[PDB]
Amino acid sequence: PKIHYRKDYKPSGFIINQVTLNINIHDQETIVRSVLDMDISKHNVGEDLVFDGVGLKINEISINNKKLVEGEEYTYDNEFLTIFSKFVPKSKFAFSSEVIIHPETNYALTGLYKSKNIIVSQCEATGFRRITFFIDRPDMMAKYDVTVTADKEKYPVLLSNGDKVNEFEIPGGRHGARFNDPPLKPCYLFAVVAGDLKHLSATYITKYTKKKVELYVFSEEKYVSKLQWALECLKKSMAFDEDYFGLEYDLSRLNLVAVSDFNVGAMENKGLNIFNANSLLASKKNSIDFSYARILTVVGHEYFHQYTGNRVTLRDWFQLTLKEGLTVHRENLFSEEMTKTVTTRLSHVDLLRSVQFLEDSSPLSHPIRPESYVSMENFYTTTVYDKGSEVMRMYLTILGEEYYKKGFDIYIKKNDGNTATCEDFNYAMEQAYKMKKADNSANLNQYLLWFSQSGTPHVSFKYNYDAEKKQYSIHVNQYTKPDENQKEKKPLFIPISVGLINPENGKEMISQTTLELTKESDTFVFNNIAVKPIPSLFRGFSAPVYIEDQLTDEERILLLKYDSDAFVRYNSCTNIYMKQILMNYNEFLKAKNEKLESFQLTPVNAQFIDAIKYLLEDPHADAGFKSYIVSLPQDRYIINFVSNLDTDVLADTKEYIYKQIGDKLNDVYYKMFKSLEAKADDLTYFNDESHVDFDQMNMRTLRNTLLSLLSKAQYPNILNEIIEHSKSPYPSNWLTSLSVSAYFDKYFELYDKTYKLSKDDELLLQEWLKTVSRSDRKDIYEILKKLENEVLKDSKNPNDIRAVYLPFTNNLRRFHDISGKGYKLIAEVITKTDKFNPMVATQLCEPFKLWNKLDTKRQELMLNEMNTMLQEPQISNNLKEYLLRLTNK
Ligand SMILES: CC(C)(C)OC(=O)N[C@H](C(=O)NO)c1ccc(Br)cc1
Numbered sequence: 004p005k006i007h008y009r010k011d012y013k014p015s016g017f018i019i020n021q022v023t024l025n026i027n028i029h030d031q032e033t034i035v036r037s038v039l040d041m042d043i044s045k046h047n048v049g050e051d052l053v054f055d056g057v058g059l060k061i062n063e064i065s066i067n068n069k070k071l072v073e074g075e076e077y078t079y080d081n082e083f084l085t086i087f088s089k090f091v092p093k094s095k096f097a098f099s100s101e102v103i104i105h106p107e108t109n110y111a112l113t114g115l116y117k118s119k120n121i122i123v124s125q126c127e128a129t130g131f132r133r134i135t136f137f138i139d140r141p142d143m144m145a146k147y148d149v150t151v152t153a154d155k156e157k158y159p160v161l162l163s164n165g166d167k168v169n170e171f172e173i174p175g176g177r178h179g180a181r182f183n184d185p186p187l188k189p190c191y192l193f194a195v196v197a198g199d200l201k202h203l204s205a206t207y208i209t210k211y212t213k214k215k216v217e218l219y220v221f222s223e224e225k226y227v228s229k230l231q232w233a234l235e236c237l238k239k240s241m242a243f244d245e246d247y248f249g250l251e252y253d254l255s256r257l258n259l260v261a262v263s264d265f266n267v268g269a270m271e272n273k274g275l276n277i278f279n280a281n282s283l284l285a286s287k288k289n290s291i292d293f294s295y296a297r298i299l300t301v302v303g304h305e306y307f308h309q310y311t312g313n314r315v316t317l318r319d320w321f322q323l324t325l326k327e328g329l330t331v332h333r334e335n336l337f338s339e340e341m342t343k344t345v346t347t348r349l350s351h352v353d354l355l356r357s358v359q360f361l362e363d364s365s366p367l368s369h370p371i372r373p374e375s376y377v378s379m380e381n382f383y384t385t386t387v388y389d390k391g392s393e394v395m396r397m398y399l400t401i402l403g404e405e406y407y408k409k410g411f412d413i414y415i416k417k418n419d420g421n422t423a424t425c426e427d428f429n430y431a432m433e434q435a436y437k438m439k440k441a442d443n444s445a446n447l448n449q450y451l452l453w454f455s456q457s458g459t460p461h462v463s464f465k466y467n468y469d470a471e472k473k474q475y476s477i478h479v480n481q482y483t484k485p486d487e488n489q490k491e492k493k494p495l496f497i498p499i500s501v502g503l504i505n506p507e508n509g510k511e512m513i514s515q516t517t518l519e520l521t522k523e524s525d526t527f528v529f530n531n532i533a534v535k536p537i538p539s540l541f542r543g544f545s546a547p548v549y550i551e552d553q554l555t556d557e558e559r560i561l562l563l564k565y566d567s568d569a570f571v572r573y574n575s576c577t578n579i580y581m582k583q584i585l586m587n588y589n590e591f592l593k594a595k596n597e598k599l600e601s602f603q604l605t606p607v608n609a610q611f612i613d614a615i616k617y618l619l620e621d622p623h624a625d626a627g628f629k630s631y632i633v634s635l636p637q638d639r640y641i642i643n644f645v646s647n648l649d650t651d652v653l654a655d656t657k658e659y660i661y662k663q664i665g666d667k668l669n670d671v672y673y674k675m676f677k678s679l680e681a682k683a684d685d686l687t688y689f690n691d692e693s694h695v696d697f698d699q700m701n702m703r704t705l706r707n708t709l710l711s712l713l714s715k716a717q718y719p720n721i722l723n724e725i726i727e728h729s730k731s732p733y734p735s736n737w738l739t740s741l742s743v744s745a746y747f748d749k750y751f752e753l754y755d756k757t758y759k760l761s762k763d764d765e766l767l768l769q770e771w772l773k774t775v776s777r778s779d780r781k782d783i784y785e786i787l788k789k790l791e792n793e794v795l796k797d798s799k800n801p802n803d804i805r806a807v808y809l810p811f812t813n814n815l816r817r818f819h820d821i822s823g824k825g826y827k828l829i830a831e832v833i834t835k836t837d838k839f840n841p842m843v844a845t846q847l848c849e850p851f852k853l854w855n856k857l858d859t860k861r862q863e864l865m866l867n868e869m870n871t872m873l874q875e876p877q878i879s880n881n882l883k884e885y886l887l888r889l890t891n892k
Pocket residue numbers: 127128267268269270271300301304305308327331380383388
């Protein structure tokens with residue numbers, strides 16, 4: 004098992020200047036002919052010429068139009084083609100090959116593969132070597148000339164990168180298209196698509212150069228009516244890059260293509276972006292609300308790659324966060340501007356502090372720029388993406404918008420058309436930092452630790468107020484726990500966006516302020532502070548850290564009601580909940596451990612419940628925000644604060660707290676559920692696919708959240724509401740009616756009803772599957788078996804498999820059944836999936852990531868299943884590496 008090390012980066016001894024491909028698609032095989040115009044680089048030391056080539060069937064290979072002979076002049080082991088240096092020319096030469104590959108049986112969905120009736124490629128990160136021989140690394144830049152041929156009836160639409168320069172007929176009912184793409188690119192950005200595709204199109208005119216850009220969005224004919232929102236999102240993305248960053252699209256055409264079988268959300272192939280259908284296609288009748296923000300994000304994300312990834316490239320894969328963290332950051336800016344809802348930022352923070360914090364305290368913890376890898380596929384992680392994006396966002400927080408845009412433009416102008424590393428970006432930001440501080444002595448050298456240091460910092464506070472001096476002090480401390488990557492953690496550059504709230508009137512006491520914490524600890528003093536303030540800390544969540552605010556619940560309630568910053572209000576609510584959860588958890592734990600016949604529980608703070616009611620009843624308050632405050636923190640957020648967590652005790656704890664709040668607020672909940680109906684379910688624009696109202700979707704989120712609370716509580720006659728809800732035109736509503744009906748005898752009636760509504764749309768059926776999987780049912784294991792036998796069956800579609808199993812794994816009480824039956828079940832699914840798609844098998848391992856955080860019995864159960872998976876003779880490299888790292892073996 005070869006380990007690649009970041010420090011070992013060396014430029015290739017070879018150069019590939021030109022790629023000329025002929026891809027001939029036939030019924031039972033695809034023939035790929037390739038000519039590489041190559042050269043010897045200055046780093047060459049007379050070494051063997053080694054190409055990557057995985058699973059290729061060689062018909063012939065040649066150097067300068069002369070056939071090479073196997074064994075004497077080359078070896079091929081199904082992974083590397085080695086041409087011995089004595090047969091390698093010392094000047095410019097041509098390498099050619101013809102190989103056979105088989106897209107029809109390629110269920111790994113990497114390289115060239117068949118998705119339903121569409122032939123499509125996926126080359127990032129190491130997929131191009133599954134199509135033809137190459138030096139398959141991102142610093143090998145080349146020109147591409149690509150011809151594709153196929154049966155015309157089956158594959159009338161042929162696409163690849165660049166300009167289509169020829170179309171032609173071929174004997175036997177075939178046709179071909181030639182695409183020339185003169186600008187240099189890395190091979191992971193190559194793509195080809197063949198199929199009976201239908202489209203929507205539009206023309207965009209750029210802001211400054213006034214260039215006409217043709218926009219095309221493609222799907223299978225069945226779902227062509229689901230393309231409109233994607234096209235609108237693309238237009239929005241282009242406008243935003245123009246308006247915020249001053250960046251225009253440089254090509255004459257951009258294609259987006261939806262396919263049904265895809266490992267991730269989408270892929271930024273140059274001029275030919277390819278998408279999971281669930282992240283491109285939607286309609287009001289056949290999609291839940293979540294799809295609209297999902298398509299906006301993923302379309303935006305792939306578009307913003309055109310600069311941050313495609314025009315400025317990576318030197319090597321260790322720089323992945325330079326294009327991914329930065330593009331996620333660009334997409335976050337875009338989405339926040341488009342939605343104009345505070346929940347957009349809150350949703351990203353909620354995901355970071357649950358999923359990414361879990362990863363960062365797990366054995367899988369890595370910095371956003373890792374030091375080594377075995378399988379590059381395994382490092383497309385929430386750390387690299389989402390913590391990466393927070394690190395990219397902190398530059399904006401530190402610099403402010405004007406100097407951030409200046410630094411960003413320095414980065415683009417200096418590295419456009421070239422490869423780059425994380426240091427290059429830091430360098431450009433540093434130049435802006437100098438301009439901002441107005442001295443060329445300032446530097447961001449410490450900031451680089453954000454790229455190299457793993458783990459989540461903990462930031463804690465103490466306060467002092469001198470009423471006679473009008474002087475306020477914030478004492479701040481930072482600490483990162485040692486782990487396997489660094490024995491000694493160094494202090495980070497942590498920007499702390501802060502406000503000071505006057506507790507008497509809720510007003511701001513100081514102007515916008517960002518504390519720059521660069522040491523292990525510091526004291527920040529403020530003068531002319533007229534009264535003791537309540538501090539509003541890490542506004543906007545200004546650094547990816549554990550925040551310990553040391554505030555009382557009284558102070559937190561005041562922030563929750565009156566602070567100006569959405570995140571601090573949300574965090575103060577979160578903190579109140581966490582204090583309560585930890586206290587009740589330990590009370591339940593003690594009673595269990597000591598086998599108590601009776602015991603006391605600490606009730607929920609009454610003033611907190613009053614504050615929730617106050618906010619819910621405020622008609623000028625935000626519906627999206629409201630849905631967060633009535634929800635306890637995510638289980639994966641909570642687990643970061645409990646050792647040896649007994650999941651049963653946590654389920655009991657949540658139950659208690661929800662029942663406490665519901666006993667006081669259910670009538671308020673019900674009243675609001677009813678009053679919100681008119682605006683939430685307004686049908687005025689139901690048949691206008693370009694009209695998307697994120698505030699209205701948030702009102703539906705709130706209604707569906709309240710309905711779940713009222714259903715669990717068995718609120719009098721709520722089943723009537725549930726039944727009426729199932730008749731709503733909006734899938735978010737009628738799918739909610741299924742999951743909340745879990746607590747009633749009508750569940751399987753709604754099961755059947757909603758299935759009938761979902762079964763004839765591929766993507767809608769997958770949302771139905773998720774709804775069933777996530778249903779709070781005592782008989783959920785029997786239900787899963789039913790899904791397997793009646794709907795899922797032997798599908799190899801990752802959307803199907805993920806929909807059936809992943810939501811169930813979040814069932815705290817049932818997935819973590821003490822028998823270990825849930826662990827057993829998902830381990831069986833992982834092993835089964837790993838036979839044909841190792842990437843998705845690794846995705847299905849997600850519930851195991853917290854294994855060493857659970858109680859000793861569940862730890863043992865999980866570890867047993869992982870060791871069982873590890874001992875499977877046919878385990879993939881990707882899955883083996885992942886489980887080896889996760890189990891510290
Ligand atoms: C937009 C989000 C953030 C959801 O990400 C993706 O949908 N896909 C990844 C991507 O960055 N696309 O640009 C991706 C591409 C290739 C590989 Br290998 C892994 C992951």
